[PDB]
Structures are given as C-alpha cells and as structure tokens.
Design a protein around this ligand. Structure first.
Ligand SMILES: [Ca+2]
Lengths: 211, 215
C-alpha cells in the first residue's frame, strides 16, 4: 500500500498569515485529495485532484504538488479554519489516508471563566456526590486545575475533559469533576476548584460551603 | 442536494456480527461509488472498501479480509457493511461516503461499540449555582453520569440555546461514561425564563429533560 506521511502533526498559526502543510507519499501518485474534519463532524472532501476546490470551499485554500510531495495552503488563516486536515490517495489498492495535521489559530490571551457547582440533591440520594467545576473560554490551552476539600488538596477521584479550539472565538474550555461518596461529602464543609493559567499570577479560586 | 443517512449506533457482543447501512437520498446519479471508512479513537482514518450501486465491482482492502463484507440492495440502492467476529479493535466510527466526479457527500457516521457490558441510561443532574456569585452572565450545567454505551447528545432549550453552550467529550471510568455540558446566559434571562438540558441516549431510547432550578 502507498503510505502517506503528513507534516506537521499539529500547528498553531497566526491569524491572517499563510499556512502550509504537506503530505509525502511512499510512491508517486497522479493526484492527492484533502479532507477537513471539524470538531464533532464527519470528514469532508476539501480539495480534490490536487488543486480543485470542493463545493463551498473559500478562495484562501489551495492545493499543489506532484509525484510524492503535496501541499495544502491557506493564504490567510481564519478562526473557522481550525480543524484537522487529512490527505488521501486513490492510486494503490487499497486507498490510504495520512495521519492528519491538526491546525489551531492564535488569539489574544483570555482568562478562564470559572464556575463551581455543588452536588444536586438528586445525586446525593444515590450515595454519590459530584462537584463540578467549569473553566470556560480561555486561551492559551495550557491550564491546571487543583481541587481542595477543607483547604487540603485532593488529587484522586477527578474526571477532566477538554474541548477542541472553538471555531468562532478560538478559545478552549475544560470541565473538572470531583466525585466523592455522599457520606464523605457530608463530612467536609469547604469545596474549592483552583485554576492556574498564564493570564493571572494568582490562581482563580471558586469555592462553596456545604450549607 | 444529496444526503446519506447511516443507521444508528450499535452495541455488539465480542464474537458477534453487525450489519450497518447507508442510504442516499433521491438522486439521478449513474456511475457513483460509495466508500466505507473506519475512524478509530476520533483520529486515524482507514479505507475499508467501496461499491458501485449502479453496478460496478466492489473494492476491498485486504487488511479487512474476513472482517468486512460490503453489499448493495438493488431495489433501494441502500449500501450495507457487515462486520464479522467482532472484537474491541473493531470499536470505531464507520462512515459511508458517496463520490460522483466533482461532488462528495459523507454520512454522519455509525459508532460501533464491542463490549460484553449492558446498556445503562445516564443519570442526568441539573447544575444550578450554589450560594451565589453575581455577574452579568450566569453559568448553568448538566451532569450526564454513568451511561453506556456512547453516544449521548445534549441540547439546551431544544436547540434555542447554542452559542453559550460547551458540551465536553465523554470520559470512560470503570466501564461507564460521564460527560457534562455548560450553558452561559444573561442573569436577566434565568431564572426568570426556563433553562432545560435535553439529553438523548439512543441505546436506551431515552430523551431526558432536566430544568435548572435555583437552589
Ligand atoms: Ca439510482
């Protein structure tokens, strides 16, 4: 099979600047196809036959190359272009795909909006107690969350989840969930989520008293 | 102009088989093909094979020999892929994609989960603020806990709230998934107006609504 190797695997691009990504084939091919996959969507053919734009694709996208070396270029990076791009060849049986280039865009630093939520009365009756902390709409993506119960750090029992870069405002969000037993929840009073992020020298603290 | 509707997500026992379908909406295409593609772990794509419903041969990828069988129903032109002797390695999203010269249309994907675990619907809990906070905006949430298999889909006010929504990827812990969703709205719109999270879990045929009420 013809193996496709893409570069770079991931990249952060300045808004309005040219972006180039490449696809190298193990053998020559006549044409290369490119696909865009945005968060939570199916892949969509984006450029076909090396240089032809799919329906609806804007003019800032182009494709070039020949033989074993192909490129996809964006003349001016826009927020909506944040996505993963895959190359795809139809010469060999079987057809193959490259591993993808994940493209993100730069923007101004933004502090997370932090919200903490006590367990719902509904959950507590089941014998579980989840305290949920959302850290929303921050940039850059690097962030750390620390839990404290009565001033003491709790590391175990935490579920974290992170969104991909938003297509509209180019930020990131995170959810952190600390799940205790109901009985252990009722033994302590103070619950706190602390966000460490480059936008502040001190962490953003949200807390509540079980009351 | 054409849309592909794939069959729904599947939970399959190890060793069993499953047949998934892909039907294109009304068209007059002649020499079109339908390709099947596996996406593992939300990342790498593999071409499984293809068919030419208006009679052409079938393309196969030898990596999937004895694993995938592709057919087409002549009557409806519905395309089918049967996956055989399933293992956890076969858990993935499977896409169908229609190609006709300079146009292409992909289905929405079918998530196949191979597991001996049974279906468990989520417990859906409303997340309202605690003692207080007070800004121009207020953030509310919904915790969707302890379900299996994926997927679930979350909406807020049946789609009328969207721009302020963040629904987070599910995480698997001890054989059950949990996810959360947050929505941020002006403080003047809640609690004065209703905010409700809508959580659908196709595997249990459930569509659960939870109104967020002040504590
Ligand atoms: Ca037909």
């Amino acid at each position: 099979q013809i193996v496709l190797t893409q570069s770079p695997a991931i990249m952060s691009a300045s808004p309005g600047e040219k972006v180039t990504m490449t696809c190298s084939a193990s053998s020559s091919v006549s044409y290369m196809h490119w696909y865009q996959q945005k968060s939570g969507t199916s892949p969509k053919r984006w450029i076909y036959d090396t240089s032809k734009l799919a329906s609806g694709v804007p003019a800032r996208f182009s494709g070039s190359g020949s033989g074993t070396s192909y490129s996809l270029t964006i003349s001016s990076m826009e927020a909506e272009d944040a996505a993963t791009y895959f190359c795809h060849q139809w010469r060999s049986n079987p057809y193959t795909f490259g591993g993808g280039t994940k493209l993100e865009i730069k923007r101004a630093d933004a502090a997370p909006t932090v919200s903490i939520f006590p367990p719902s009365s509904e959950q507590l009756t089941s014998g579980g107690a989840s305290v949920v902390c959302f850290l929303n709409n921050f940039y850059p993506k690097d962030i750390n969350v620390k839990w404290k119960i009565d001033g003491s750090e709790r590391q175990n029992g935490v579920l974290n989840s992170w969104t991909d870069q938003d297509s509209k405002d180019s930020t990131y969000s995170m959810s952190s969930t600390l799940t205790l037993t109901k009985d252990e929840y009722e033994r302590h009073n103070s619950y706190t989520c602390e966000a460490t992020h480059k936008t502040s020298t001190s962490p953003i603290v949200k807390s509540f008293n079980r009351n | 102009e054409v849309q592909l509707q794939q069959s729904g997500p599947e939970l399959v026992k190890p060793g069993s088989s499953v047949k998934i379908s892909c039907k294109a909406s009304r068209n007059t295409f002649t020499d079109y093909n339908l390709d099947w593609v596996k996406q593992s772990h939300g990342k790498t794509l593999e071409w499984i094979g293809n068919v030419y419903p208006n009679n052409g041969v079938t393309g196969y990828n030898q990596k999937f020999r004895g694993k995938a069988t592709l057919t087409v129903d002549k009557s409806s032109s519905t395309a089918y892929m049967e996956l055989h002797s399933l293992t956890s390695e076969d858990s993935a999203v499977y896409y169908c994609a229609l190609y006709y010269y300079d146009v292409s249309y992909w289905g929405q994907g079918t998530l196949v989960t191979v597991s001996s675990a049974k279906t468990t619907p989520p417990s859906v809990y409303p997340l309202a603020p605690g003692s207080a906070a007070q800004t121009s905006m207020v953030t509310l949430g919904c915790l969707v806990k302890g379900y299996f298999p994926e997927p679930v889909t979350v909406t807020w006010n049946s789609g009328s709230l969207s721009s302020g929504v963040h629904t987070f990827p599910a995480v698997l812990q001890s054989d059950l998934y949990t996810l959360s969703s947050s929505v941020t709205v002006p403080s003047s719109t809640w609690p004065s107006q209703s905010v409700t999270c809508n959580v659908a879990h196709p595997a249990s045929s459930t569509k659960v609504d939870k109104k967020i009420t002040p504590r």
